[PDB]
Design a protein around this ligand. Structure first.
Ligand SMILES: O=C(O[C@@H]1Cc2c(O)cc(O)cc2O[C@@H]1c1cc(O)c(O)c(O)c1)c1cc(O)c(O)c(O)c1
Ligand SMILES: O=C(O[C@@H]1Cc2c(O)cc(O)cc2O[C@@H]1c1cc(O)c(O)c(O)c1)c1cc(O)c(O)c(O)c1
Ligand SMILES: Cn1c(=O)c2c(ncn2C)n(C)c1=O
Ligand SMILES: Cn1c(=O)c2c(ncn2C)n(C)c1=O
Lengths: 815, 815
């Protein structure tokens, strides 16, 4: 398409730039891929272009890191077990102003760059929100000119590739490195030792960790480009490698796999803790290798570690890298020979912890036996930390033994465990939630005792998304029509979107806003046909719930509504209803049974709804296979209605909600997480807010949630439960959904029936406004225009000023 | 050193060529390695140069393979489980005439290219002779313009890196790909399925192999340059990969390792069969993937497979890829649907087998149960092959049931097994030994019954070595002085070395020949000091035995001589003897106990000899650690005396013997293998030939080898055995060498004591001639000058005309 090359926000196709791009495209095709045009596949062409484009990163990559050496600013180390990065090619081109040039260059070579882009595998090294937040954060940190380093693990296999088979999820390994990763640079020369198991000997000069098994940590460095500032930061991902030295010789060589299994696969759990030793090993591996790099870089700068927190910030993405606190102490005390108290002064000032959930099954609580075996010296240090910390509690609250037991890092029981959130709080100067309501809920509940001891520690940092990936990349049509009115500065100053409120009554913007949405919808519809032979009605309302499958996110509530629409159609076939394509998508953790049942229910509903000739194209329900960052970039720009329907108090923030707001969808949701702040930014009048508020959930809990009451009082709801029990959605297996029915009736922690009625009526209001295109689009304008707060640039600037103590900059580097 | 850049056989340093080399060196340093000069290590500089040099291969690589597509010549597939390739960088530069240019280019950048070369890891994907023959063969095949493809396995770990610790061998994994391989091109797009286990169902149209576990075979292609002919052939090495589809999900991902273990490590056995299922899997993996490529290329050329043997030659390097015979039949019968007899016509005409040993512990005899489980359809086919083959025996020799049982592919016993040599003979049109004596010994003994049935099958192909690696690369000084007299054509026409017999009385050549040897010796001496802090006397005779540690190669015989020299010195301290550095080197297979004892004995002798102040620098015995192709290239040019002392009839050919002859060493050896032909080429008067001849070994076997006789009749020998028994060479452990003593006295298959006396006296003749420099050097000239026959170019030309049916060419391709 030539129209796309006329998108100004995609930059200049300079005649010489084009000429050079083609020359280097053809150079990589010959020397790097060893192909000629006669045997070259699209995949080769994608790689030629990827190599060509990565070459443009290299100069800035070297100069940026030298700049940091020269200026010696405080360094931000963002430790996370996940980096949900997605694809890199388009992102590279946008941040380097090369998109239109590459598009013209490939066009002259007879190629469609859009097709080439689709050959790239996602770097799916995350589960969901926490992982994708880390990716967004790296991008914003680069755009804000921070000396910032992402540190994590190079999983051989990312989040599993989901296939739906028989209506059921099947998992297949995500072999994302099969054809190579052209972005990363392997750094074997900078390999570091990590120790495991062993024993502690307390000798003359103190403790010594000995008799340890070594696993080498090999770093791969990936470039992280800011938005047109000539800044390229580094994401460093550690890969596990058997040590150089040592059933026989053959077996010994084979057994090198055991150690190398630590970096093999992402644990595919979203918001759920599994106490597997391999997972614990992964956490120590990232923390140990990462902290050796930080100490070395600290020493090779302009030992006295009193200035370590002036030059080092370690940000903990959840408790997953929590061992960085005992590990930093270990290095400082056992190897650098610092007194414990100075070491602890340094540690607390250097470390800060970000919490992502109040849900108990997600919080890390490691058995002491496991910590004792695998990391004996760390357990010792944790116990010491706990004694001095509880001593402070005692002195602050004399005689409150109850607070002592509650605040202990050590949790008593049949199995003694270490509470890793407690360790983080004790060992960090800053603790933040990711949305106002969540940060409030932490100081009033889960962490209230810690808030009372150290109020000053507790902060809020409302999550954000990068408007590069999540607008310019994914929705170029919308970015353009915005740029035509207000220019391009908003791309790294998203609060400038408020200027668009001046256009609520401009007929061309109203027309253009709707036209872009139509275009995104036609393109997504076409996508399902070619890739999955699925027919969807492009003049239907696109109702999308995409996110990991969960009880607390209430995909089930969405199911109940969908079946309601179906049954209402059957009772009154002749009555007009706004046509709808209900799209639900997301992965279930492989061991989460309810989530796999929920996926099966969505498809089972589809099997009835989509083949009923009375319904026809009035209602269609499809399960979007293999939801991942690449598919988010397709389906979200195409969405009319954003489903954000978690039980009030359960979704700490959400980030999918913000992506939908940024891309021209209206939101139907509870007052939970950032939904609260999104409605405050836009006005509640521009959101479909429904359901119980947190305080209402509490009152139910106070008197007990009896699901039976709602079933006995709501005829439409009872009908649906009867259809599920008796086997209307599973004729060949009538009892198939009994577990779903049983949880809803007797063990529903998330109170789906209690929001059922308000939800259904709120959906009626949605349909009503959809019948009025002009006013739909006008309310959409009011949303897009107030979405600026939810830029990750704002989030990061806040981290920088309020926790890290660094001042962000958007000034370009010379290049 | 500037002198080396004045070596004409290293080509022109063209001013523009130099300029471009530096530009691309600096380009790879920046864009490929992402370094600058301030942080660049030697290793980076080596990689920049490797990348730069590999770029010069690419154009010829593509054009050569297109040339083969266009002309459609018969294709040679050299199947081997080993490719002992060594380093590639210097070899690339010599075959492309880039050596002096790169040397000047790196010099102007302030770099020593010789230092850079030493950072390259060997591709040590072989054990010894059979492996290095395959490497030599690929090089000659390229130089002779044959459409030839090396096919094997990309082992993750090659032959183990040997460390001597306490006088003992220790094995460490050969992590040859730790910092990457810049020569190979990964080809994931050409991945192929290989099947294992399963069952056979005989249906309508015939048999079907079903219920199989799949292992993907991923090819990596390495360039193979001929000598200045613009030809670049391909070595394709298969790497094992878990299939795309499927204790839980985590465990399933981890368990992908099991399948990927097939390409993990070379079995480090030299001339020894180990019936491990993993080894069998390796053999099938290479044969199955390789034959799918051959069939596909056959079909994509200008199905009737009557012309398959006109377009395809499969050469089997030992019985290791023997399954190619049942596998080709399987494809032809079960998938292409050809009648068995036409399929068998095709198979025999396509396959040929090369035998490398007459020793029984080396020959492959696989248990039928193992073949039945792992490859059920192959076993079926083997049985059928055996029936029709034995039917031919029966018809040729009616009533000889004894011949039937002896010639059977099936060997009866407690465990029934398949004899893989027998399968090869039955399924191949050509069977060759690798030296005249060995090829004769096969038709008179091991394979006499097969020779009687099919005389026409049995050939000789005396082994060879490439004069590129083994003269021009490793000994540039010698190549030059040769080139000054006769020019450069000899480098690919080695028989031209006979012209050097005209110089036996030329004083400058005599001077120059000796001067080069002195230079190689001083350089090797310096090597031991820097890398191992070992002092050797450069005015001593360099007595070198390098090769895998073996009973049959008789390193022990060398030990006996060394101790004799030591004891003779002690009895008569004042008596002059020619100073000697005895150098023994080689790896023992990890499970071969005697070989590990032999290594310990060599070092133990050193511990006495090298610290006796009466001996001083008159005698020194050192064990050369980690003998591999790179070290062969150093030590052999430095050698005065080549130890080739296998028991007559045991070493099929040898190739180390030819490397020493080519590089200016005189040979002390038995009449075994190619030693017989080397002495015929030079004249026995120019070789130190000693010991029993094969017929003498036979007579001993006829009456029984009683070691006691030699001990009771030879005082000097009895003394040494007493020193070994009583613990003179092991004071802290007197009984340490009892196993050696016991084998020599009672279970010596290789009759060391029977050649002891003739060996010792032959060594006296060696020392005597060494006292006369002029006549030493003159005899060396007579050796170098007659070494031409032992070029692998001659060997390969013979394979091509006498087995493959293709005419070699040394004409350059346009480029
Ligand atoms: O199905 C079409 O695209 C798919 C859907 C889609 C989207 O919704 C948003 C987005 O950011 C990208 C995107 O890439 C999809 C796509 C998939 C392919 O396999 C492919 O080859 C391609 O060019 C693209 C399509 C159809 C069209 O008819 C068309 O003209 C076009 O440009 C594209
Ligand atoms: O020890 C020296 O080389 C080593 C021995 C050696 C050899 O015997 C033959 C050969 O083909 C190459 C060869 O490379 C060796 C070597 C090892 C190194 O670690 C190294 O840095 C190097 O430049 C080289 C040496 C000493 C010298 O004094 C010298 O001038 C020199 O050029 C080289
Ligand atoms: C019970 N359960 C699981 O068993 C689970 C999970 N996420 C992953 N798994 C395995 N969640 C959220 C959960 O509630
Ligand atoms: C007995 N034996 C072994 O046990 C052996 C070997 N090569 C390897 N091994 C393990 N050889 C040659 C051998 O004779």
């Amino acid at each position: 398409q030539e129209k796309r090359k006329q998108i100004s926000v995609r930059g200049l196709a300079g005649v010489e730039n084009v000429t050079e791009l083609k020359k280097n495209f053809n150079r990589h095709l010959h020397f790097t891929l060893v192909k000629d045009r006669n045997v070259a596949t699209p995949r080769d062409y994608y790689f030629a272009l990827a190599h060509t484009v990565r070459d443009h990163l290299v100069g800035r990559w070297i100069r940026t890191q030298q700049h940091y050496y020269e200026k010696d600013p405080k360094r931000i180390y963002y430790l996370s077990l996940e980096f949900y990065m997605g694809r890199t090619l388009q992102n590279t081109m946008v941040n380097l102003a090369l998109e239109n040039a590459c598009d013209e260059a490939t066009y002259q070579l007879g190629l469609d760059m859009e097709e080439l882009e689709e050959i790239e595998e996602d770097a799916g090294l995350g589960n969901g929100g926490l992982g994708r937040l880390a990716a967004c954060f790296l991008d914003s940190m680069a755009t804000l000119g921070l000396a910032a380093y992402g540190y994590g693990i190079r999983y051989e296999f990312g989040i599993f590739n989901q296939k739906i088979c028989g209506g059921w999820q099947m998992e297949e390994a995500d072999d994302w490195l099969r054809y190579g990763n052209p972005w990363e640079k392997a750094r074997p020369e900078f390999t570091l030792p990590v120790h495991f198991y062993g024993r502690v000997e307390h000798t003359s000069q103190g403790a010594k960790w000995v008799d340890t098994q070594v696993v080498l940590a090999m770093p791969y460095d990936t470039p992280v480009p800011g938005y047109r500032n000539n800044v390229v930061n580094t994401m460093r991902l550690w890969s596990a490698k058997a040590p150089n030295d040592f059933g026989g010789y053959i077996q010994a060589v084979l057994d090198r796999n055991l150690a190398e299994n630590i970096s093999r696969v992402l644990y595919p759990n979203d918001n759920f803790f599994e106490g597997k030793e391999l997972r614990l090993k992964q956490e120590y591996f990232v923390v140990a290798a990462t902290l050796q790099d930080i100490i070395r870089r600290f020493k090779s700068s302009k030992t006295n570690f009193d200035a370590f927190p002036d030059k080092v910030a370690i940000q903990l993405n959840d408790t997953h890298p929590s061992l960085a606190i005992p590990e930093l102490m270990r290095v400082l005390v056992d190897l650098e020979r610092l007194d414990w108290d100075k070491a602890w002064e340094v540690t607390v000032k250097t470390c800060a912890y970000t919490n992502h959930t109040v849900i108990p099954e997600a919080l890390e609580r490691w058995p002491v036996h496991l910590l004792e075996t695998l990391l004996p010296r760390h357990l010792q240090i944790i116990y010491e930390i706990n004694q001095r910390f509880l001593n402070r509690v005692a002195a602050a609250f004399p005689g409150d033994v109850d607070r002592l037991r509650r605040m202990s890092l050590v949790e008593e029981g049949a199995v003694k465990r270490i509470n890793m959130a407690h360790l983080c709080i004790a060992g960090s100067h800053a603790v933040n939630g990711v949305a106002r309501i969540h940060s409030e809920i932490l100081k009033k509940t889960i962490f209230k005792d810690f808030y009372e001891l150290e109020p000053h520690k507790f902060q809020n940092k409302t999550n954000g998304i990068t408007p590069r990936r999540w607008l310019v990349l994914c929705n170029p049509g919308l970015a353009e029509i915005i740029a035509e009115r207000i220019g391009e500065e908003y791309i790294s100053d998203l609060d400038q979107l408020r200027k668009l409120l001046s256009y609520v009554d401009d007929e061309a913007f109203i027309r253009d806003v709707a036209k872009v949405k139509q275009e995104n919808k036609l393109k997504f519809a076409a996508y399902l046909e070619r890739e999955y032979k699925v027919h969807i009605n492009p003049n239907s309302l696109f109702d999308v719930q995409v996110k990991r499958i969960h009880e607390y996110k209430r995909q089930l509530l969405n199911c109940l509504h969908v079946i309601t629409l179906y049954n209402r159609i059957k009772k009154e076939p002749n009555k007009f209803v706004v046509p709808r394509t209900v799209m639900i998508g997301g992965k279930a953790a492989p061991g989460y049974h309810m989530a796999k049942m929920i996926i099966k229910l969505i498809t089972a509903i589809g099997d009835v709804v989509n083949h009923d000739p009375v319904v026809g194209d009035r209602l269609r329900v499809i399960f979007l296979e293999n939801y991942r960052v690449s598919l988010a970039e397709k389906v979200i720009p195409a969405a009319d209605l954003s489903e954000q329907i978690s039980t009030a108090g359960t979704e700490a923030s959400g980030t999918g909600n913000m992506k939908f707001m940024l891309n021209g969808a209206l939101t139907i949701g509870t007052m939970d997480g950032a939904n609260v702040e999104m409605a405050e930014e836009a006005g509640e009048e521009n959101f479909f807010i429904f359901g119980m508020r947190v305080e209402d959930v509490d009152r139910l809990d106070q008197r007990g949630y009896n699901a039976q009451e709602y079933y006995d009082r709501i005829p439409e709801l009872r009908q649906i439960i009867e259809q599920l029990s008796s086997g209307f959605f599973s004729p060949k297996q009538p009892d198939l959904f009994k577990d779903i029915v049983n949880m809803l009736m007797h063990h529903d922690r998330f109170k789906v029936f209690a929001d059922y009625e308000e939800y259904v009526k709120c959906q009626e209001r949605v349909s009503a406004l959809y019948k009025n295109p002009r006013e739909w689009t006008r309310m959409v304008i009011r949303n897009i225009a107030t979405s600026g707060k939810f830029s990750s640039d704002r989030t990061i600037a806040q981290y920088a000023r309020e926790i890290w103590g660094v001042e962000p900059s958007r000034q370009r580097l010379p290049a």
